[model samples]
Target chain A: GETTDGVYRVMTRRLLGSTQVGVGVMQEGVFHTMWHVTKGAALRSGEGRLDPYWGDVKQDLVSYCGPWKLDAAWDGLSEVQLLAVPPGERAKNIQTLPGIFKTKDGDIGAVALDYPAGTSGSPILDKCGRVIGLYGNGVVIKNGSYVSAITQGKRE
Target chain B: DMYIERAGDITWEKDAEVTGNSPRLDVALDESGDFSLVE
Candidate 1:
């Protein structure tokens, strides 16, 4: 029904198939997001910046660092979780050049501070007007002693 | 992986295809890769 399911060029030729759209076909079993988050160029959008690549045959193409779609803000009592990871995947903390992306919301984005290239994933809050976290390994809130208790329900 | 990915040898071109430096390179990447558009 399809070719090698590898890197196929997408053009006017045979744009219709078994949901196999050229290089995008290898990603048949995969789910992807077609949207991206756009903000000030000085800041990065977030993690998973580029579209998912599920090609069976890899090709060398011109890929660049651009804006992407991701989480925005977070609350301390947010739907966030973290797990221990192997040492190899953990990104070493840095000052200005660390591999982190700040959102348009400011230095703290939804997925930046919580995810340090480790083993677990965390909840990405999208609430408005909250300094949930920072690009560094620090949480940036207006005050360190304030608390908000509002939970509709629990996971269990 | 910008530098890591582009760490290749070379590619000879027929002409100076890529023209002028992008003054708003940062701005452009946020919107589109095309040079004539602005978001």
Candidate 2:
């Protein structure tokens, strides 16, 4: 039988899609699934009766990785849906995607996002499909982007 | 059903210098530097 797209081509196509999962997504039709595993320092503002002396308190920190899903859209542009409002209350609190969260190693967790991540060029998306913002390099989680050798200092 | 829609790894470290009866002053990486992916 004659080949259509060729065996080599078919295999290569499948591999391409799988590998692209870790690649940066910039536009539609491109690999929309990408993630970043980064390391950052945690700082806490003291309230009262406390010393401002703090250091790297914990280690072995890790973040979740997956596709930048489009949960929904607001104002304009596309976004990724991430979470759902728990049942109850007088009314539903607009089920919107609120980006990723923080937790222990190999465990699932949730945390409030300081800003959007998937607003056009962001890396993570909310369950309701909002472009929260990118990850890493920001004072907060929604103010920076860029990958480097060290989470800090010059890389060798 | 719920699933790991998105995720990744993150490294976090905080170090301080406590010595010489000095005020506990710990200079951190501003907030962006500090961490190594080991695994």
Question: Which candidate number maximizes lDDT?
Answer: 2
Can you write out model 2's per-residue Cα lDDT over A112-147, one digit (the tens) per residue? Answer: 222233211123333333333322322222224212
* Candidate 1 per-residue C-alpha lDDT over A59-110 given as tens digits, one digit per residue, 9 for 90 to 100: 1111113221122334423332111122233222111111122324232212
Error of 2 at A141 (Å): 17
TM-score, chain B, each candidate: 0.17, 0.19
Model 1 / residue B7 / CA error / Å:
22
Candidate 2's docking class is incorrect
**lDDT (Cα, tens digit) per residue for candidate 1, span B1-39:** 100101111112222222211011111112331111123
lDDT (CA) for every model shown?
Answer: 0.19, 0.21
Give the interface RMSD of candidate 1.
19.6
